[PDB]
Structure 1
Amino acid sequence: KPIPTWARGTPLSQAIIHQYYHPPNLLELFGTILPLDLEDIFK
């Protein structure tokens, strides 16, 4: 599989450092982890 520029080599590395120094609000970006609904999943 060809590997996107962003995911390879250097541009990955920069994306990581920025992200490391800019910890965003995780409640916003992802939300509230809901209880796993075992039945509405395996049936």
Structure 2
Amino acid sequence: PIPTWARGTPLSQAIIHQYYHPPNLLELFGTILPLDLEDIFKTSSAVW
């Protein structure tokens, strides 16, 4: 059973809405913190 928001005309309308009314993504999702492999599990490529 697929939620009603996630198909048909309701998804179409929400997609339209989101596309033309973009939100503030920062306050919605925050900064992306550096990935700490030690906490997750246990060269020039990091110089931005």
Q: TM-score, normalised by structure 2?
A: 0.83
| Structure with the greater alpha carbon radius of gyration | 2
Higher relative contact order (CA 8 A, sep 6+): 1
Q: CA RMSD in A?
A: 0.5
Q: CA deviation at 1:8?
A: 1.0
Q: How far off is 1:27 after superposition?
A: 0.6
State the 4+ residue runs in structure 1 displaced beyond 4 angstroms: none
Counting matched residue pairs gives: 42
Q: Which runs of 5+ in 2 are unaligned?
A: 43-48
TM-score by length of 1: 0.92
Question: Which has a greater percent of helix?
Answer: 2
